[PDB]
Structures are given as C-alpha cells and as structure tokens.
Amino acid sequence: EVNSFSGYLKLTDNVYIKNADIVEEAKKVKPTVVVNAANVYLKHGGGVAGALNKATNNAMQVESDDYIATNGPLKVGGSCVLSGHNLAKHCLHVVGPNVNKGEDIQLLKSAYENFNQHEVLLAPLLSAGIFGADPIHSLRVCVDTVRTNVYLAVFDKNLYDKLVSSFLEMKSEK
Ligand SMILES: Nc1ncnc2c1ncn2[C@@H]1O[C@H](COP(=O)(O)OP(=O)(O)OC[C@H]2O[C@@H](O)[C@H](O)[C@@H]2O)[C@@H](O)[C@H]1O
Ligand code: NA
Known part of the structure; x- marks a missing residue:
C-alpha cells in the first residue's frame, strides 16, 4: 500500500505537515516519491541527504556518483529522478540555493x-x-509554488510548532 500518509496537518489544499523524521516516514508510507535536499554534485552530506543515504546503505550515493559521471552536476534549482531504493519508488533530488554561500534565495521557487x-x-x-x-x-x-500534494516531514518538534505558528500569522495577515 503506497502513499499511506497518516497524521498530517493540512495547511492548504495541497500542503500537509507532520512532526516526523523523513526516513521513518518513508519506511511507514512507502511513498512513490521521496524528496532529497541535494547539492549540485549529489554528494550527500549531513542533513536529510545523509539520512536517506545511510538508510539505503550507501546505495543512494553510488547511484548519484553514477548519475554525475554520465550527466555532470545539476544546476541550482534543478532536480533529477533516481531510484528510491528501499525507501521509495523514486527519489527526487532537488537542489535548493545555498544561502550560506550567498546563492540566490529566489532559486528556492x-x-x-x-x-x-x-x-x-x-x-x-x-x-x-x-x-x-x-x-x-x-x-x-x-x-x-507547489500545486501537487506535498507531505512535509519536519522532525524537530520546536521547529514544527514555530512553523505552524508563523504560517498561521502569514495566512491571516495579522
Ligand atoms: N531526517 C530528517 N527528517 C526530516 N527533516 C530533516 C531531517 N534532517 C534534517 N531535516 C530538516 O530538513 C531541512 C532541510 O535541511 P538539510 O537536509 O540540511 O537541507 P538543505 O538546507 O537544503 O542543505 C542541503 C545540503 O545538506 C546536505 O545534507 C546535502 O548533501 C546538501 O549539501 C532542515 O530544516 C532540517 O532541519
Ligand atoms: Na505531527
């Protein structure tokens, strides 16, 4: 039974949020697509990317190395679809801007x-x-930006509560 999401809070008609770890969710939900927060060289570091990769016993990193060897790095704002291995059918690797290095925050769109x-x-x-x-x-x-159904895994409970509170204020506009 794929895409069996449960316990999410509905934020908009297509965005849902849950205080959960993305790897534990993937194991529970069996999603068609899990999203990796990637860099342009698909070198999977210490956030979600490392978590997902470790859960695949490094299969994600080997597949990514093979992708890069054939295709070259991604561009910021770009993506590629690879295997989701034991976690999902597919993994969508998406490169957000690295704001710490001054990349353009508008590329998050x-x-x-x-x-x-x-x-x-x-x-x-x-x-x-x-x-x-x-x-x-x-x-x-x-x-x-997103019009399709996005289930957001936010593992830190304090961040989750902060996000919901800030979302409500922006939506009500006071
Ligand atoms: N296991 C997890 N489950 C859910 N959310 C998580 C998890 N680990 C981290 N997060 C949260 O998800 C958000 C994404 O953070 P990162 O994974 O660091 O992603 P990003 O900020 O885009 O940095 C990308 C960079 O990090 C490396 O892992 C990756 O290779 C790339 O270079 C943050 O709010 C982070 O706290
Ligand atoms: Na929750």
Whole structure:
C-alpha cells in the first residue's frame, strides 16, 4: 500500500505537515516519491541527504556518483529522478540555493517547481538546514509554488510548532 500518509496537518489544499523524521516516514508510507535536499554534485552530506543515504546503505550515493559521471552536476534549482531504493519508488533530488554561500534565495521557487512534476511527494523543507535559509521562508515558498500534494516531514518538534505558528500569522495577515 503506497502513499499511506497518516497524521498530517493540512495547511492548504495541497500542503500537509507532520512532526516526523523523513526516513521513518518513508519506511511507514512507502511513498512513490521521496524528496532529497541535494547539492549540485549529489554528494550527500549531513542533513536529510545523509539520512536517506545511510538508510539505503550507501546505495543512494553510488547511484548519484553514477548519475554525475554520465550527466555532470545539476544546476541550482534543478532536480533529477533516481531510484528510491528501499525507501521509495523514486527519489527526487532537488537542489535548493545555498544561502550560506550567498546563492540566490529566489532559486528556492525554481527548486520547489520541480515538485509539480509529481502527483504526491514526501519532502523536507528545502535549503532550511545546512543551506541556511529561514525555515519559515522555505515553507512560504513551498506553499506558494507547489500545486501537487506535498507531505512535509519536519522532525524537530520546536521547529514544527514555530512553523505552524508563523504560517498561521502569514495566512491571516495579522
Ligand atoms: N531526517 C530528517 N527528517 C526530516 N527533516 C530533516 C531531517 N534532517 C534534517 N531535516 C530538516 O530538513 C531541512 C532541510 O535541511 P538539510 O537536509 O540540511 O537541507 P538543505 O538546507 O537544503 O542543505 C542541503 C545540503 O545538506 C546536505 O545534507 C546535502 O548533501 C546538501 O549539501 C532542515 O530544516 C532540517 O532541519
Ligand atoms: Na505531527
């Protein structure tokens, strides 16, 4: 039974959020697509990318190395679909801007646009961790950009509560 999401809070007609770890969710939900928050060389570091890769026993990194050897690096805001291995049917690797290095935060719109090629996705908040974007800003861009069904896994309970509170204020406009 694929895409068996449960316990999400509905934010908009197509964006849902849950205080959960993205790997544990993938194991529970068996999603068609899980989203990786990637860099342009698909060298999977210490955030979601490392978590997903470790859960595939490094199969994600070997596949990514093979992709890069054939195709070269991605562009910021770009994506590629590879295997989801034991976690999902497919993994959508998306490159958000690295705001810590001064890349353009507006490319987060381009990054989330990639979600619109998939009916339903399990995803993290792009650029909001190692890449240093404000998590509330990443959620705002997600809500304004994605039209397909996005289930957001936010593992930190304090961040989750902060995101919901900030989302409500922006939506009500006070
Ligand atoms: N296991 C997890 N489950 C859910 N959310 C998570 C998890 N780990 C981190 N997060 C949260 O998801 C958001 C995404 O953070 P990152 O994974 O660091 O993604 P990003 O900010 O885009 O940085 C990308 C960079 O990090 C490396 O892992 C990756 O190879 C790339 O270079 C952050 O809010 C982070 O706290
Ligand atoms: Na929750």
